[PDB]
Design a protein around this ligand. Structure first.
Ligand SMILES: C[C@H](CCC(=O)O)[C@H]1CC[C@H]2[C@@H]3CC[C@@H]4C[C@H](O)CC[C@]4(C)[C@H]3CC[C@]12C
Lengths: 11, 240
């Protein structure tokens, strides 16, 4: 569901 | 007898944990200050605490052998669903049965039932959470088992939204076998009596705690004045 901050922290 | 791979896994997880859980709690000073009187007076402080903890759990998860092999989307689904559970699990390290509280280094950073209940969440969540802490503490798990449990919790194939559940299951089984074998080879009886079964039960207990936390979060998200006091990461992970 588009999780910008989470995605950024995972990459 | 614990293959070379299994010892490898355990070594990786212990290190990952040491790099993401600071027992000096030195970063707690950056959180909005705790307020003990208390109408939602602890919400700002605990919101930052949980948000910080979410970041740490993500750091841990990324070091779990095999996690990196999952797709970006699956990693996100797993973290979103397990975050609160892993936070509750890792918190067992600061929890003390002496006075039923999470002692994070100092008076201001020592939280009991009255403190933890001043953030919008009710005893319907807190009472079972405290009970969980006691039951887990009584397992006297080796740090090796503690880190394996957190990793198993994160890499759960039955989480809503998982795509490559097969890949997730494989990764988890590798961890589950490492746990079952470590208990047999490194946890002498009687402390090992049905330990795996009891640890799996804690995973069930956490699903229940997760479900209740989610129920109350939704309710609270309906009140802007509270949602306003949270962090962007919390809002994103728990729902916006
Ligand atoms: C201080 C403890 C960690 C200690 C450590 O890391 O060693 C953490 C882990 C479990 C957390 C509770 C989780 C459910 C609720 C979330 C809501 O966003 C705020 C309240 C809620 C009741 C939290 C309070 C703080 C707790 C008890």
């Amino acid at each position: 569901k588009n999780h910008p901050m989470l995605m950024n922290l995972l990459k | 007898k614990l293959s070379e791979e299994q010892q490898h896994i355990i070594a990786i997880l212990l290190d990952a944990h040491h790099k993401t859980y600071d027992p000096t709690y030195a970063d707690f000073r950056d959180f909005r200050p705790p307020v003990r009187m208390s109408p939602l007076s602890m919400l700002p402080h605990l919101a930052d605490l949980v948000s910080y903890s979410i970041q740490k759990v993500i750091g841990f998860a990324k070091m779990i052998p095999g996690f990196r092999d999952l797709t970006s989307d699956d990693q996100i689904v797993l973290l979103k669903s397990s975050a609160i559970e892993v936070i509750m699990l890792r918190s067992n390290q600061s929890f003390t049965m002496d006075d039923m509280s999470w002692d994070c280094g100092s008076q201001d950073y020592k939280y009991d039932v009255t403190d933890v209940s001043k953030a919008g969440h009710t005893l319907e969540l807190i009472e079972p959470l405290i009970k969980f802490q006691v039951g887990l503490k009584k397992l006297n798990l080796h740090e090796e088992e503690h880190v394996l449990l957190m990793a198993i919790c994160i890499v759960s194939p039955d989480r809503p939204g998982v795509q490559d559940a097969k890949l997730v299951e494989a990764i988890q089984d590798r961890l589950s076998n490492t746990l079952q074998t470590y208990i047999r080879c490194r946890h002498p009886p009687p402390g090992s009596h049905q330990l795996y079964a009891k640890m799996i039960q804690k995973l069930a207990d956490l699903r229940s705690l997760n479900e209740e936390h989610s129920k109350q979060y939704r309710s609270l998200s309906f009140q802007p004045e509270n949602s306003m006091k949270l962090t962007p990461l919390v809002l994103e992970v728990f729902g916006n």
